Amino acid sequence: SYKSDQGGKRLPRIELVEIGPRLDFKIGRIHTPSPDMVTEAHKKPKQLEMKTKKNVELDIMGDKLGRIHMGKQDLGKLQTRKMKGLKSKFDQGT
Amino acid sequence: NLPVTVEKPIPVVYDLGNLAAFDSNVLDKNDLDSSNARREEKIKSLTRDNVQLLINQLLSLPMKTTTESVGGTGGQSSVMTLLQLPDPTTDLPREKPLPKAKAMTKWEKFAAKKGIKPKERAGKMIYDEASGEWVPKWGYKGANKKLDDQWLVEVDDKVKGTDNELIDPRTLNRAERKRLVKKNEKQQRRNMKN
Amino acid sequence: RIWNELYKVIDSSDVVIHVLDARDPLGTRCKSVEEYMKKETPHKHLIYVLNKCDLVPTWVAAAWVKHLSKERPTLAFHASITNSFGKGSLIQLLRQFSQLHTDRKQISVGFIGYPNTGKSSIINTLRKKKVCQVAPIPGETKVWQYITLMKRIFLIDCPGIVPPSSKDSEEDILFRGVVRVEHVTHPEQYIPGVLKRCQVKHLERTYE
Amino acid sequence: EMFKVIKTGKSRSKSWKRMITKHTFVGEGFTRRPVKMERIIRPSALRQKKANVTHPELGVTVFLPILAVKKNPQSPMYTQLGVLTKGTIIEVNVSELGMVTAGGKVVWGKYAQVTNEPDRDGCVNAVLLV
Amino acid sequence: GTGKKEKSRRIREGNLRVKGENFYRDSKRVKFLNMYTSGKEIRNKKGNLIRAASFQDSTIPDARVQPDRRWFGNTRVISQDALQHFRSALGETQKDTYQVLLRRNKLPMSLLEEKDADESPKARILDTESYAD
Ligand SMILES: Nc1nc2c(ncn2[C@@H]2O[C@H](COP(=O)(O)OP(=O)(O)O)[C@@H](O)[C@H]2O)c(=O)[nH]1
Ligand code: ALF
Ligand SMILES: [K+]
Ligand SMILES: [Mg+2]
């Protein structure tokens, strides 16, 4: 690593010096695994990870938090009470 | 002052957990053939550009610092700053299959059926009433073998009229304890067979 | 006795629903009980139900819901066994709380608030049956009551509470629907409060 | 002595409820069980959250919050109910004592033993185990 | 009705079975429901206590605490890095109205609640001058 003088002191310039051994491999023969063995080898334990539950999170302070969703409150489908004091027919002093 | 901004036709993908880079660009067979004399320089330059990109990513990774000193557990002291490597992405097969969970034994099935909760297992020490000491209840100098060294044992009335009358009660209790141990071993081997 | 019942239902509840009147929700808010709940029992979930929304204009209910949602989850409601509003939203919110606490084997939802806000009416609305006694007179409910809504959800009915204060005058307490009017001395002294709180046209239409 | 029979029913014929007459620690996030399934009753007035803990070194006593009930000497059942009686080992928050390990870690939880009868004197007194 | 007998139901689906277990109840259900009639003391013809009432046994236990070095060690410690992380986190939290607290984390909150104050409390004048002076 050498000082780059263009990317600052945080980004150096890289150079390589070969150590060996340099090798040229000719790919002669192949023997492949069966799909069931592939799946069995690439299975995961999953005991390590915390189970991810919907609407549940763990914040920066380590408190378990849950989220609730109110939904859409459509107040246009609410019929208010038809009180006598809101009716024009009972007008006075006309 | 050489540049540190490698420009590539196809963007290189990275596996920082494995410290690996993958570029899927075009390589000229005539420039990489063993007949040529610049082939090693070509390989060195390609590896140089890929390593420059990988090192840029690694030094752009978030860093972990600490204020603890040397002489404690952990390895990282205050002067050290460590890269936080992500989880590796390349799928690699395991050497051995996952540990299968052992099937429930006869005791476990019985305890589940009867609703017996497991023991607390606080410790092996018990208080001996006749003395004023806490003693192990089993094992090395355990309290399960005090009858073996008791100075005086009363011969039970039920042993009369039997051929075991003349036998030491300490030896009889040792035989019974060993039989219980062997019964436990046989039950374990039965659970393993099943 | 009433405050003993209140602390009993709070100690027994996982979710606490504070019921406000849509005509005067700030008047019907129990701020001291809210502060006690947020200080001592932070694991209990306090939400707002704005009841009697059928008695206010729609924009008034919407504005109150918006302003109270800056503090707590607030649901607009109209309590009625036959023709209600908000019942499905309240039920799905309770199911969400049960799903969050799915390891508790049951959760309890305690209804607290001022007298006559409609706690028993909301419980009857949720059960679709008159299971709690309801009356226009304050203090109809005296002891707590358990109601099984679903297999994992219990509702707790509580008597209404009026937190003590010095700024709350007798006129304010009377106009919050708290006291029984038959037991007051001189209601003509409170009628000017009705005149100040009501529109002239509305009064003249009501009484011709 | 530990439990008190609580009779239920109009004629008081059922006696399956029990009330713990001693002081208890219930811990964070306690919610009372539904009354129909509440067999063991720990009244809220007898619940405790803090104790007067005395450090044998430097001779001081501090009002510390309780973290857990480690061992009640009477029974593991009383341990899991959180009974606070004399001789009970409890876990206490010692953040204000300023204890630091030899490795530099700040100690904020230690063990103490209750030395009084809180049901008799209205308070929990304990001695830290140092 | 050979198919409706208790034996046949056990075939369709030894000493561990309890009384009352049928098509509607298993053993745990039976014992939980017998809780509601459990709390009674049993006495004989002459007044001997056959079995004491549940949670009413009168035998005095032998309450002892064994010596153990687990009693004198630390139970909870915290590193300086974790302390600084939680101290910085307390202040970055933007509380949402639709997030409820499911479980509070156990932390040394007395060490973590440190906010800079622009003013000092008043000096204790009784330290320098008493009432008698
Ligand atoms: N218009 C209207 N009246 C209601 C509503 N909810 C309750 N009430 C009325 O308010 C009065 C008191 O109801 P109640 O449930 O007993 O109040 P509680 O003291 O909180 O239990 C009853 O006469 C109900 O008819 C509502 O949503 N709209
Ligand atoms: F709170 Al009520 F009648 F139940 F006033
Ligand atoms: K009422
Ligand atoms: Mg009511």
Per DSSP, which regions of B98-168 are E strands? 125-127, 134-136
**Is some CB atom of chain E closer than 8 A to the CB atom of D3?**
yes
Compute CA B126 distance to the chain's CA centroid, rounded to the nearest angstrom.
Answer: 32
Q: Is C157 annotated as a binding residue?
A: yes
Atom 23 in ligand 1: residue holding the nearest Cα = C136
**Cis omega before residue E121 (within 30°)?**
no
Residue C127: count other Cβ atoms within 10 Å of its Cβ.
15
C129 token code pair: 């049956």
Contact C100 A55 (CB under 8 A): yes
CA nearest to B131, candidates B110, B115, B146, B116: B146
Q: What is the C115 CA–ligand 2 centroid distance (Å)?
A: 4
Residue D90, strand partner residues: D69, D112
CA–CA distance, C46 with C109 (Å, rounded to integer)? 10
Per DSSP, which regions of D1-130 are E strands? 3-8, 14-20, 23-24, 40-41, 50-55, 60-71, 83-84, 89-92, 99-100, 106-114, 125-128
Q: What is the C112 CA–ligand 2 centroid distance (Å)?
A: 10
CA–CA distance, C206 with C208 (Å, rounded to integer)? 6
C52 token code pair: 């009697």
Asked if D5 and D67 count as a contact pair (C-beta separation under 8 A), the reply is no
CA–CA distance, B14 with B54 (Å, rounded to integer)? 7
* SS3 assignment, position D90: strand
Positive or negative torsion for Cα A76, A79, A84, A87: positive
CA–CA distance, B176 with B144 (Å, rounded to integer)? 12
Q: What is the C134 CA–ligand 2 centroid distance (Å)?
A: 8
CA–CA distance, E78 with D105 (Å, rounded to integer)? 6
Pocket test for ligand 1, best of C116, C141, C178 (most atoms within 8 A of CB): C116
| Ligand 2 close to Cβ of residue C140 (< 6 A) | yes
State chain B's maximal CA–CA distance in angstroms: 107
D44 token code pair: 């809220």
Q: Which letter, b or e, does each residue of A27-46 get, where b requires 16 or more Cβ atoms within 10 Å of its Cβ? A: eeeeeeeeeeeeeeeeeeee
Residue C17, strand partner residues: C47, C111
The secondary element (H helix, E strand) that includes residue B171 is helix B169-193
State chain C's maximal CA–CA distance in angstroms: 60
Compute CA C66 distance to the chain's CA centroid, rounded to the nearest angstrom.
Answer: 18
Residue by residue, DSSP assigns A32-74 as PPPHHHHHHHS----SSSPP--TTEEE-TT--EEEE-------
CA nearest to B10, candidates B22, B28, B18: B22
Query: Which residues, 6 or more positions from C47, have their beta carbon under 8 angstroms from its beta carbon?
Result: C15, C16, C17, C18, C72, C73, C74, C75, C93
CA nearest to C119, candidates C103, C101, C141: C141
Strands D106-114 and D40-41: unpaired
Residue E112: count other Cβ atoms within 10 Å of its Cβ.
15
Strands of the A64-67 sheet, one edge to the other: A56-58, A64-67, E99-103
Positive or negative torsion for Cα E51, E53, E55, E56: negative
CA–CA distance, A65 with A55 (Å, rounded to integer)? 8
| Ligand 2 close to Cβ of residue C193 (< 6 A) | no
CA–CA distance, C13 with C109 (Å, rounded to integer)? 5
Q: Is C120 annotated as a binding residue?
A: yes
Asked if C132 and C147 count as a contact pair (C-beta separation under 8 A), the reply is yes
CA–CA distance, D63 with D125 (Å, rounded to integer)? 9
- Do E and C make contact via 3 or more CB pairs under 8 A? The reply is yes
CA nearest to B117, candidates D26, E28, E53, E66: E28
| Ligand 1 close to Cβ of residue C145 (< 6 A) | no
For residue C104, give the chain E residue with the closest CA: E102
Positive or negative torsion for Cα D31, D37, D43, D49: negative
* SS3 assignment, position A88: helix
Strands C74-76 and C45-51: parallel
Atom 7 in ligand 1: residue holding the nearest Cα = C118
Residue by residue, DSSP assigns chain C as -HHHHHHHHHHH-SEEEEEEETT-TTTT--HHHHHHHHHH-TTSEEEEEEE-GGGS-HHHHHHHHHHHTTTS-EEE-B--SSS-BSHHHHHHHHHHHHHHTTTSS-EEEEEEESTTS-HHHHHHHHHTS--S---SSTT---S-EEEEEETTEEEEE--------SSS-HHHHHHTT-S-GGG-S-GGGTHHHHHHHS-HHHHHHHH-
| Ligand 1 close to Cβ of residue C159 (< 6 A) | no
Residue B63: count other Cβ atoms within 10 Å of its Cβ.
10
- Do B and A make contact via 3 or more CB pairs under 8 A? The reply is yes
* SS3 assignment, position D33: coil
Query: Which residues, 6 or more positions from E60, have their beta carbon under 8 angstroms from its beta carbon?
Result: none
C65 token code pair: 């819901």
Residue B192: count other Cβ atoms within 10 Å of its Cβ.
9
CA–CA distance, A56 with E102 (Å, rounded to integer)? 9
Across the interface, which of A68, A78, A80 has its CB nearest the CB of C73? A68
Pocket test for ligand 2, best of C140, C161, C176 (most atoms within 8 A of CB): C140
Resolution, angstroms, 1 dp: 2.4
Atom 2 in ligand 1: residue holding the nearest Cα = C52
* SS3 assignment, position B190: helix
Instruction: Return the CA Rg of chain E.
Output: 32
What totals of helices (H) and strands (E) does chain A contain, helices first?
Answer: 1, 2
Asked if D26 and D47 count as a contact pair (C-beta separation under 8 A), the reply is yes
| Ligand 1 close to Cβ of residue C195 (< 6 A) | no
Cα end-to-end distance, chain E, whole Å: 103
For residue A70, give the chain C residue with the closest CA: C93
Q: What is the B15 CA–ligand 4 centroid distance (Å)?
A: 64
CA nearest to E76, candidates D90, D111, D84, D71: D111
Query: Which residues, 6 or more positions from C131, have their beta carbon under 8 angstroms from its beta carbon?
Result: C123, C124, C147
Contact D67 E74 (CB under 8 A): no
Residue C65: count other Cβ atoms within 10 Å of its Cβ.
20
- Angstrom distances, CA of residue E82 to CA of B66, D96, E73, E115: 10, 17, 21, 18
CA nearest to B155, candidates B167, B143, B163: B167
Burial degree of C79 (CB within 10 A; 0-12, 13-18, 19+): buried
Between C119-127 and C87-100, two packed helices, what is the crossing angle to 10 degrees? 80
Across the interface, which of C56, C205, C206 has its CB nearest the CB of A91? C205
Whose tokens are 């009915």? That residue is C157
Nearest ligand to residue C119 Cα: 1
Q: Provide the 8-state DSSP code for A13.
A: B
CA–CA distance, C146 with C143 (Å, rounded to integer)? 10
CA nearest to C124, candidates C99, C96, C90, C92: C90
Give the technique used to solve this structure.
cryo-EM
- Angstrom distances, CA of residue A29 to CA of A22, A25, A26, B17, E35: 21, 12, 9, 30, 73
Q: Which amino acid is at B121?
A: R
CA–CA distance, E79 with B74 (Å, rounded to integer)? 12
CA–CA distance, C149 with C154 (Å, rounded to integer)? 6
State chain A's maximal CA–CA distance in angstroms: 109
CA–CA distance, B4 with B6 (Å, rounded to integer)? 6
Asked if C153 and C107 count as a contact pair (C-beta separation under 8 A), the reply is yes
Asked if D97 and D53 count as a contact pair (C-beta separation under 8 A), the reply is no
- Do C and A make contact via 3 or more CB pairs under 8 A? The reply is yes
Range list of H helices, D2-112: 76-81
Contact B72 D103 (CB under 8 A): yes
Residue D110, strand partner residues: D92
**Is some CB atom of chain C closer than 8 A to the CB atom of A60?**
no
- Angstrom distances, CA of residue E99 to CA of A59, B145, C45, D109, E95: 11, 60, 10, 30, 8
Cα end-to-end distance, chain A, whole Å: 96
Nearest ligand to residue C136 Cα: 1
C-alpha distance from B125 to closest chain D C-alpha (Å): 14
Residue B63, strand partner residues: B83
* SS3 assignment, position D126: strand
Residue by residue, DSSP assigns B38-98 as SHHHHHHHHHHHHHHHHHHHHHHS-EE-----TTSTTS--TT--EE------S----SS--
Residue E28: count other Cβ atoms within 10 Å of its Cβ.
13
Residue C145, strand partner residues: C157
* SS3 assignment, position E71: helix
CA–CA distance, E20 with B166 (Å, rounded to integer)? 51
CA–CA distance, B101 with B98 (Å, rounded to integer)? 9
* SS3 assignment, position D50: strand
CA–CA distance, E9 with A38 (Å, rounded to integer)? 45
Whose tokens are 């005086």? That residue is B152
Residues near ion ligand 4 (CB < 5 Å) are C 119-120, 141
Q: What is the C132 CA–ligand 4 centroid distance (Å)?
A: 7
